[PDB]
Amino acid sequence: SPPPIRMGVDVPDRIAGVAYPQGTTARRLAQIGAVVTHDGDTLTVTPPSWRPDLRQPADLVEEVLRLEGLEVIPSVLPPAPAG
Amino acid sequence: SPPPIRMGVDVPDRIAGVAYPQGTTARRLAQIGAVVTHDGDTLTVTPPSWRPDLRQPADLVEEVLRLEGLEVIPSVLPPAPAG
Ligand SMILES: [Mg+2]
Ligand SMILES: [Mg+2]
């Protein structure tokens, strides 16, 4: 198995900008074959042996977001920086 | 005396963007001749008879800000949206 990855439970929610229903991250990561454990608000995710591409929290975020569907991500223009 | 005015104790701070020391608003408003009573966090301000220009909380805000000095107000860029 690849080494375990520590990641906050709401990290996919923050990066997506969507408040997913609770347990979405844990369910999706378990769906793709990873072992997920809880420690307060921090998950420890061990990817399956056939997923060496999952090495960082960003890799896990893509798994949750693509399975939930990028279409649910709202179009929110960022504020204009003083250019 | 003009009618009394109700105003939050920190309203001058919010409009100025400056955290004034405690009691600044009450001290400045009593300085210019108004009667100030405290009801928790809400100030009741009765301006003196020679100040018929003090009718709204914004008027009291100007009194506090101008006496503390507009030079203490910092320079912060507003959150303009994408145009
Ligand atoms: Mg990936
Ligand atoms: Mg005025």
Domain edges within chain A: 5-72
Q: Tell whether residue A53 is among the known ligand binding residues.
A: yes
Q: ∠A25-A29-A34 over CA atoms, to 5°?
A: 145
- B-chain CB neighbours of A77 within 8 Å are 81-82
Residue B49 C-alpha from the chain's centroid: 18
C-alpha distances in Å from residue B50, one per residue of A5, A25, B5, B83? 71, 66, 16, 46
Q: In CATH, which of 3.40.190.10, 3.100.10.10, 3.30.56.10, 3.40.140.10 is domain B5-72?
A: 3.30.56.10
Q: How many of the other CB atoms lie within 10 Å of CB of B52? A: 9
Cα of B59 to ligand 2 centre, how many Å?
5
Q: Tell whether residue A63 is among the known ligand binding residues.
A: yes
Residue B61 C-beta-side C-alpha neighbours within 13 Å: 14
Experimental technique: X-ray
- A1 neighbors A40 (Cβ within 8 angstroms): no
B44 - beta bridge partners? B6, B37
Q: Kindly state whether B76 is in contact with chain A, defined as any CB-CB distance less than 8 angstroms.
A: no
CB contact under 8 A, B82 and A82: no
**Resolution limit, Å:** 2.3
Region at B71 (left for phi over 0; alpha for psi -120 to 50; beta for the rest): alpha
